[PDB]
Amino acid sequence: SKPLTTIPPTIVVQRPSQYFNNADGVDQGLPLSLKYGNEVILKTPFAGTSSDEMALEYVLKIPNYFSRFKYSSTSLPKQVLWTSPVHPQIIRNHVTVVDAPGQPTLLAYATGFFKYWRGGLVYTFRFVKTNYHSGRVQITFHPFVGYDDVMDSDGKIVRDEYVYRVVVDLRDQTEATLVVPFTSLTPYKVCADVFNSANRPKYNYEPRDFKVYDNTTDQFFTGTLCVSALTPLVSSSAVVSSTIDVLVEVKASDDFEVAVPNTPLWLPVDSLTERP
Amino acid sequence: SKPLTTIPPTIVVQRPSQYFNNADGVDQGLPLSLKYGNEVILKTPFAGTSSDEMALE
Amino acid sequence: SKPLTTIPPTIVVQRPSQYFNNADGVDQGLPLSLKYGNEVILKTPFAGTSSDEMALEYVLKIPNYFSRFKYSSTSLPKQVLWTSPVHPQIIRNHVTVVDAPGQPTLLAYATGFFKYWRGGLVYTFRFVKTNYHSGRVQITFHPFVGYDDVMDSDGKIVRDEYVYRVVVDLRDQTEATLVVPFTSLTPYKVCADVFNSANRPKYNYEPRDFKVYDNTTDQFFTGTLCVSALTPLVSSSAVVSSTIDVLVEVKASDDFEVAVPNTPLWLPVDSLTERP
Amino acid sequence: THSIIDFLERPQFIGSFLWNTSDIENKEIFSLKLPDALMSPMIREKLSGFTSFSASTVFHIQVNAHPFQCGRLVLAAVPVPDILPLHRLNMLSFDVSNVITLPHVQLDISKETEVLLKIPYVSPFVQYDLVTKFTPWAAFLAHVYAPLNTPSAASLQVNVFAHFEDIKLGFPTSAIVAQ
Amino acid sequence: DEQPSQECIGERILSFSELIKRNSWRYVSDEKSLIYPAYAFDNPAAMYTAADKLPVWTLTPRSGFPTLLTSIGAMYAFYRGGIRLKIVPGVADQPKPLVEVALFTMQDQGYIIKANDYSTDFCSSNIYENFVTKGIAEVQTPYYSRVNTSVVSAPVLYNAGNISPLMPNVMYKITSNSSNILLGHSAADDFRFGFLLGAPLAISATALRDNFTGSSATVSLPTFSNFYLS
Amino acid sequence: DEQPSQECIGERILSFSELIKRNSWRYVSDEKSLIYPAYAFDNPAAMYTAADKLPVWTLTPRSGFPTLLTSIGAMYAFYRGGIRLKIVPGVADQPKPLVEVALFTMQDQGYIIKANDYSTDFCSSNIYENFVTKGIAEVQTPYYSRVNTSVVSAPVLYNAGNISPLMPNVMYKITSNSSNILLGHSAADDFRFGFLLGAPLAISATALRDNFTGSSATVSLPTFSNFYLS
């Protein structure tokens, strides 16, 4: 028979597109393949690897070379040799042109897809040298302080007394690595963005300068990592250069986390050029 | 993940007001009280009587 | 295959927004976070407390200082010293300006979010004094009667004989508290609102006056709580002031309840000022 | 044996404050900021070398009235004063009742010679920023509840003592204790 | 005894937590494309007067009018958790019926209302709702905060921009095709207030119809009636 | 410790795989009937300058602007799996509200955008969605590749036509009745990227509003706001 429905009415919601902004949920698309189900198997391994290459854990732990410096016969007790603010938005200069923003490192590019970050950073120094060089260097991390404020007017380090100190004998060791903790009164810091040097509505966006830690900068970086010399790099100028390069790489620690994905800080292109 | 729905389509009926004329069924009204459930207990006895006064009998 | 649906049709309801006005139910919003689920944990404790701070039980039991008065050498047997109507819409005067409505107490502000109230009230008197003061005072509650009608033309209390009486020796006791029952022929009374003193469509809204209990007022308050003196506050004027302050606080009892939330009686602002 | 904490747990004399007959209902006797009010050289010395710290805070108020003087104080606490919406901060100076609603304790000089209050660290920041000095996390304030009631005008000293408890220190640093 | 509540009311309410999940209206805009500061919880500044031929009360909203949400929030110092957002249209534009709400995070942008200018904020969280088919737009907003405890009506500053720690550093970008639009909000499921302070600075609401100075009552509020009829 | 992520964020994200299922906008068209190259993953070519009275940046899209999808993809060399497609209308054409997306496979046709000319491509996979009733068009696209591993932004060639092995030899034919239409895409469920290379060539996005040369900022992006208001 053709009986009267006893199926009670349910309330409904009209949405044009659900989970549009979401990694969760069931996409309600129409498929184009003949088979509604058509999916393809997760082939393993893929691109030579079985490691997950799309994992943040994987990506942010890829070493970014981001800076070098010199250590020499010149260099003097307590002379700062090198500093960096500790944060993930580490950048380079484009070759083609000379914009202010610059070319992001991988790390920076990736973190760039989020607003919030936290965690520790793995900094790695390589001392390209021979055995006939001898000298010491102390790596020190100064939380809650910018790279101007770690050195007095003479470029000598200030109050090294008060922090984690890492002595390096070059007679022995040619390389050194360490982890800088996250250190903040906030659970999350913000992925540093370029700031407007000009006044509105004039816009000249430039990378931030963390010479100083105060509440204009404080929530973009934990502090400043500094490499002070202890001895001049004494060597036989007779047979070896009396100055050497020191290379610095960074990757993320295990505890490293980002969140609040949105409009990214960085934007990718197929080529960059000067205007006629 | 964000998999393709496998939930088949059901046919639906557009009514503006169901059971409007009916003592049966589920009224589909919006409630005004803060609590969607808000109902009040059938107090007994009521108006001095426990006999059903609305009964035709 | 692609078989014919055997899924019978259900009746549906088109609503633009469900549970909009409701604390119940499932909100049908789109989430902005990447994760549809994104919720955050109920952190405990929070703001130093694990007690629920949003509970009416919690809030209405916060003491509201709302009134004082004086007890002195002047004061005379049966002389009323102080009265209040018993109800939750207890108010103060703004400092900045002098509107009629006034600044609500916390209690009043809160209850203000509902129309109906019921329950008992905890009134607390503190007698700021020394030990060298001596005197008695009777606190008495008069249900179904307004604050003019509790005292005769001389400001002497009327028919105290007929009610709960609470004698207080000041030689001994410096403080006193009590609960006033709800007492009504209605299960619920109404949160008193300001009334129009003017005639429509002229509007001058003023706080209600419960000098008298009759069926223009009766459903805003249970009655009047009165503090009559028994003895003058005899003291050595030689070494102590012959008049003292008496402070009165109120909070809600356990049995206290409100309901019918709607447009509130009170409205909050970031600042209040005179017009140029 | 001794340790940093032991010092911050040391109870300091913070101030003597005048309260006299003329002072009236809700007249503020003081309004002291946490941690500022406790930041004595002694403390600063020991806190030196650390980015920040957090703690609960103990407040003893002392009032040596004599038998014929009656009166009554509030001591209350309020969070993050620096950044509270003004209307709040105002409501406090406006009406004692908006202090009585707070975390507080009353003192009746005739009965009590003293009373305490303890205040937990409460803030968005997990500690007090010792370099940025970003927002003192609370403040104690003592408004007069019921004015000092002597026969003839007179005045009284309200002493304050205080220390920290449940202390927690931040990562150490070459940055300097905010002035 | 919970008898009365069952005999008369039919419900029984115990915490404001219950109440603030009810959506109340906040603010109106004329902008097709608007930047709104979600976690703004301020209320208007008020002005009273007794002098003749002057409107008695007058209200200057900085970020909107009192919702249940804010009205309550005034009592507390802190908040945490997320919020809901409801949106109503002046115009059901048949051929362009859509609404975008998007997650707005520009670092330099200031945390108060402003009309959309940016044309270059690609790839953000975008929700879409159809004004024609579903009368109202309904949305949920993650706490997404840099800290575990935020502050009621934090004093924003000129270039506090959108990175103040004392709030979630997040705003709404609302792009409609109704000229006029009405905004409202309730708290989300996980939302909570903190550290009760006392009554907030407040004035009678029923009193806002005062006109005893002859000069008629001007000050109105964002309700449906007031919006839909213009 | 995963406490912060639960106390503040309310979520916790671990792989870009998660992110690239979020739909971002790619490209706009004026064509009622358009041929789009689905698995084009290129990004624009950029131009900078410091000289007065010149727009600082300028962008030449070959097949569209950076989606989350492509933005990410730039880091990797290879891809496999299928994609989603979202479409938005300028015009909800009441009497002709429909959209066709169809599977387009003409062998000789070139793998870049072009307006539909062919009238003779019968019997193809056609999905239909109703712009009026369901505001947006939503679609899923099989990898349908000749090989198990395809290449990020493969250099297409003049007559690489539509049979290059280095991609799925498949395009969309989109026939609407909205003059203007807005395209977006996320990755499908089965999609995956491969062989991480490093950072891609990139420039600040927030910087695209530079105008210090006096000549105002011209370069805009395909967002909703920019589309819906013209």
Domain region containing E103: 1-230
* Residue appearing with tokens 């104690």: D140
Taking every pair of Cα atoms in chain E, the longest distance, rounded to a whole number of angstroms, is 61
- Nearest CA of chain B to the CA of E1: how many Å? 14
Is the dihedral angle over the CA atoms E36, E38, E39, E45 positive or is it negative? positive
Burial of C89 per CB tally in 10 Å (0-12, 13-18, 19+): buried
Q: How many cross-chain Cβ pairs, A to E, lie less than 8 Å apart?
A: 66
What three-state secondary structure class fits F3?
helix
* Residue appearing with tokens 């108010």: C91
Q: Name every chain C residue with its beta carbon within 8 A of the beta carbon of E15.
A: 52, 54-56
Token pair of F130, please? 């109703």
- Nearest CA of chain C to the CA of B6: how many Å? 14
D-chain residue closest to A188, CA distance: D125
* Residue appearing with tokens 């509540």: E5
Token pair of D149, please? 């009631």
Distances (CA, A) of F184 to D64, E122, F28, F29, F86: 76, 11, 9, 12, 5
Let me know: does F63 contact F40? Beta carbons within 8 Å: yes
Residue A118 β-bridge partners:
A257
Residue count of chain C = 276
B-chain residue closest to C21, CA distance: B34
Let me know: does E212 contact C202? Beta carbons within 8 Å: yes
What three-state secondary structure class fits D28?
strand
Let me know: does A143 contact A137? Beta carbons within 8 Å: no
Phi, psi of F35 (to 5 degrees): -105, 110
Let me know: does F83 contact E138? Beta carbons within 8 Å: no
Q: Using CB atoms, which residue from D51, D127, D132 is nearest to A214?
A: D132
Pairing of strands A205-206, F171-175: unpaired
- Nearest CA of chain E to the CA of D119: how many Å? 12
Burial of B47 per CB tally in 10 Å (0-12, 13-18, 19+): exposed
Nearest Cα neighbor of A186 from A263, A115, A133 is A115
Domains of chain D, by residue range, sit at 1-179
Let me know: does E10 contact B31? Beta carbons within 8 Å: no
Token pair of F43, please? 């990004």
- Nearest CA of chain C to the CA of F186: how many Å? 13
Let me know: does F73 contact F122? Beta carbons within 8 Å: no
Residues A121, F12: Cα–Cα separation, whole Å:
19
Pairing of strands C175-180, F150-151: unpaired
Q: Pinpoint the alpha helices (H) of chain D.
A: 4-8, 41-47, 86-94, 97-100
The structure's method of determination equals X-ray
Distances (CA, A) of D135 to A37, C49, D130, D173: 58, 21, 10, 20
CB contact under 8 A, E105 and A196: no
Chains D and B touch (3+ CB pairs under 8 A): no
Let me know: does E87 contact E181? Beta carbons within 8 Å: yes
Chains D and F touch (3+ CB pairs under 8 A): no
CB contact under 8 A, E7 and B33: no
User: C257 touching E, CB under 8 A?
Assistant: yes
Let me know: does D163 contact D10? Beta carbons within 8 Å: yes
Pairing of strands C10-14, B12-14: parallel
**Sheet strands side by side (includes A121-127):** A64-72, A243-252, A121-127, A175-180
CB contact under 8 A, D174 and A159: yes
- Structure's resolution in angstroms: 3.6
Q: Name every chain F residue with its beta carbon within 8 A of the beta carbon of B3.
A: 189
Distances (CA, A) of E85 to C215, D109, E177: 44, 53, 18
Query: Residue F87 is which amino acid?
Result: I
Residues E227, E28: Cα–Cα separation, whole Å:
8
Phi, psi of F80 (to 5 degrees): -155, 165
* Residue appearing with tokens 């060597």: A235
Distances (CA, A) of A137 to A146, A166, A169, A171, D50: 20, 8, 7, 12, 24
Phi, psi of F99 (to 5 degrees): -130, 135
* Residue appearing with tokens 């003087």: D69
Residues F152, F79: Cα–Cα separation, whole Å:
6
CB contact under 8 A, C202 and E211: yes
Residue count of chain A = 276
Query: Residue D135 is which amino acid?
Result: T
Q: How many cross-chain Cβ pairs, C to D, lie less than 8 Å apart?
A: 84
Residues F177, F198: Cα–Cα separation, whole Å:
42
Let me know: does A38 contact A31? Beta carbons within 8 Å: yes
Instruction: Please provide the distance, in angstroms rounded to a whole number, between the alpha carbons at the two ends of chain F.
Output: 49
Q: Using CB atoms, which residue from A17, A116, A264 is nearest to E123?
A: A264
Let me know: does A124 contact A250? Beta carbons within 8 Å: yes
DSSP state of B46: B
HSE-up (13 A, CA, CB side) for residue A151: 21
Residues C147, E17: Cα–Cα separation, whole Å:
37
Token pair of E197, please? 């302070």
- Nearest CA of chain C to the CA of A177: how many Å? 35
Residues F65, F57: Cα–Cα separation, whole Å:
14
- Nearest CA of chain E to the CA of B4: how many Å? 19
Residue C156 β-bridge partners:
C79
DSSP state of D150: -
User: B54 touching A, CB under 8 A?
Assistant: no
F-chain residue closest to A116, CA distance: F9
Let me know: does E114 contact E102? Beta carbons within 8 Å: no
Distances (CA, A) of C235 to A245, C12, C158, D69, D150: 92, 81, 27, 13, 12
Token pair of B48, please? 């001095």
The H or E element spanning position C176 is strand C175-180
Residues A111, F138: Cα–Cα separation, whole Å:
29
User: Which residues contact residue C30 at a Cβ distance below 8 angstroms, ignoring those fewer than 6 apart?
Assistant: A15, A18, A20, A21, E101, E127, E128, E129, E138, E139, E140
Token pair of F58, please? 């300028």
User: A63 touching F, CB under 8 A?
Assistant: no
Let me know: does D146 contact C245? Beta carbons within 8 Å: yes
Let me know: does C157 contact C163? Beta carbons within 8 Å: no
Phi, psi of C85 (to 5 degrees): -70, 145
Q: Name every chain E residue with its beta carbon within 8 A of the beta carbon of C43.
A: 80, 148
Instruction: Please provide the distance, in angstroms rounded to a whole number, between the alpha carbons at the two ends of chain B.
Output: 62
Let me know: does F217 contact F208? Beta carbons within 8 Å: yes
Token pair of F116, please? 């539909």
R_g over Cα of chain F: 19
Nearest Cα neighbor of E162 from E112, E117, E127, E120 is E112
Let me know: does A5 contact C9? Beta carbons within 8 Å: yes
CATH number belonging to domain D1-179: 2.60.120.20
Portion 178-237 of A in contact with F at CB < 8 A: 187-188, 193-194, 198, 201-205
Nearest Cα neighbor of E39 from E203, E205, E164 is E164
Q: Pinpoint the alpha helices (H) of chain C.
A: 56-60, 106-111
E-chain residue closest to C273, CA distance: E47
CB contact under 8 A, A17 and E103: no
Residues C33, C31: Cα–Cα separation, whole Å:
6
Let me know: does F127 contact F66? Beta carbons within 8 Å: no
Q: Name every chain C residue with its beta carbon within 8 A of the beta carbon of D149.
A: 128, 240-241, 243-245
HSE-up (13 A, CA, CB side) for residue A41: 5
What three-state secondary structure class fits C270?
coil
Residues D17, D21: Cα–Cα separation, whole Å:
14
Q: Using CB atoms, which residue from C48, C66, C129 is nearest to D70?
A: C129
Query: Residue A83 is which amino acid?
Result: T
Token pair of F226, please? 């920019």
Burial of D151 per CB tally in 10 Å (0-12, 13-18, 19+): middle
Token pair of A240, please? 């070896």
Distances (CA, A) of C115 to C88, C104, C143, C266, E9: 11, 16, 21, 12, 11
Q: Name every chain F residue with its beta carbon within 8 A of the beta carbon of C39.
A: 10
DSSP state of F17: H
Burial of A76 per CB tally in 10 Å (0-12, 13-18, 19+): middle
Portion 24-53 of B in contact with E at CB < 8 A: 33-35, 37-41, 43
Query: Residue F196 is which amino acid?
Result: L
What three-state secondary structure class fits D47?
helix
Query: Residue A266 is which amino acid?
Result: W
Pairing of strands A243-252, A64-72: antiparallel
Residue F46 β-bridge partners:
A272, F59
CA quadruple D121, D124, D125, D126: dihedral, nearest 10: 50
Burial of A3 per CB tally in 10 Å (0-12, 13-18, 19+): exposed
DSSP state of D84: S
- Nearest CA of chain A to the CA of C53: how many Å? 25
The H or E element spanning position D33 is strand D28-34
Let me know: does D51 contact D121? Beta carbons within 8 Å: no
Nearest Cα neighbor of A121 from A111, A133, A112, A131 is A111
The H or E element spanning position E224 is helix E224-228
The neighbours of chain A, by the rule of 3 or more Cβ pairs under 8 Å, are B, C, D, E, F
Residue C70 β-bridge partners:
C245
Q: SS3 letters for chain A?
A: CCCCCCCCCEEECCCCECCCCCCCCCECCEECCCCCCCCCCCCCCECCECCCCCEHHHHHCCCEEEEEEEEECCCCCCEEEEEEECCCCCEECCCCCCCCCCEECHHHHHHCCEEEEECCEEEEEEECCCCCEECEEEEEEEECCCCCCCECCCCEECCHHHCCEEEEECCCCCEEEEEECCCCCCCCEECCCCEECCCCCCCCEECCCCCCCCCCCHHHCCEEEEEEECCCCEECCCCCCCEEEEEEEEEECCCCEEEEECCCCEEECCEEEECC
- Nearest CA of chain D to the CA of C4: how many Å? 60
Let me know: does C135 contact C261? Beta carbons within 8 Å: no
- Nearest CA of chain D to the CA of A167: how many Å? 17
CA quadruple F159, F165, F170, F171: dihedral, nearest 10: -50
Burial of A273 per CB tally in 10 Å (0-12, 13-18, 19+): middle
- The enclosing domain of F135 has a CATH number of 2.60.120.20
Phi, psi of C143 (to 5 degrees): -70, 150
CA F92, F95, F101 angle in degrees (round to 5)?
65
Nearest Cα neighbor of C34 from F15, F191, E116, F139 is F15
Let me know: does C126 contact C109? Beta carbons within 8 Å: no
Residues C50, C73: Cα–Cα separation, whole Å:
48
The neighbours of chain B, by the rule of 3 or more Cβ pairs under 8 Å, are A, C, E, F
Instruction: Please provide the distance, in angstroms rounded to a whole number, between the alpha carbons at the two ends of chain C.
Output: 80
Residues F103, F29: Cα–Cα separation, whole Å:
18
Token pair of C72, please? 């002195």
The H or E element spanning position C244 is strand C243-252
CB contact under 8 A, E124 and A263: yes
* Residue appearing with tokens 């020499």: A72
Alpha-carbon F17 to chain mean position? 17
Residues F182, F29: Cα–Cα separation, whole Å:
7
Residues E151, F95: Cα–Cα separation, whole Å:
52
Q: How many cross-chain Cβ pairs, B to F, lie less than 8 Å apart?
A: 8
Q: Walk me through the domains of chain A, giving residue ranges and CATH numbers.
A: 1-276 (2.60.120.20)
Token pair of A15, please? 């949405």
Pairing of strands E192-196, E76-80: antiparallel
Alpha-carbon E138 to chain mean position? 14
Nearest Cα neighbor of D108 from C123, C251, C127, C242 is C127
Residues C75, A109: Cα–Cα separation, whole Å:
82
Token pair of D74, please? 């509030």
Give chain F's domain count: 1
User: Which residues contact residue C164 at a Cβ distance below 8 angstroms, ignoring those fewer than 6 apart?
Assistant: C140, C141
Let me know: does D82 contact D145? Beta carbons within 8 Å: no
Answer whether the bond into residue C201 is a cis peptide, omega within 30°. Answer: yes
Q: What does the DSSP assignment read for C157-174?
A: B--GGGS-EEEEETTT-S
Nearest Cα neighbor of D52 from D123, D106, D1 is D123
What three-state secondary structure class fits C108?
helix
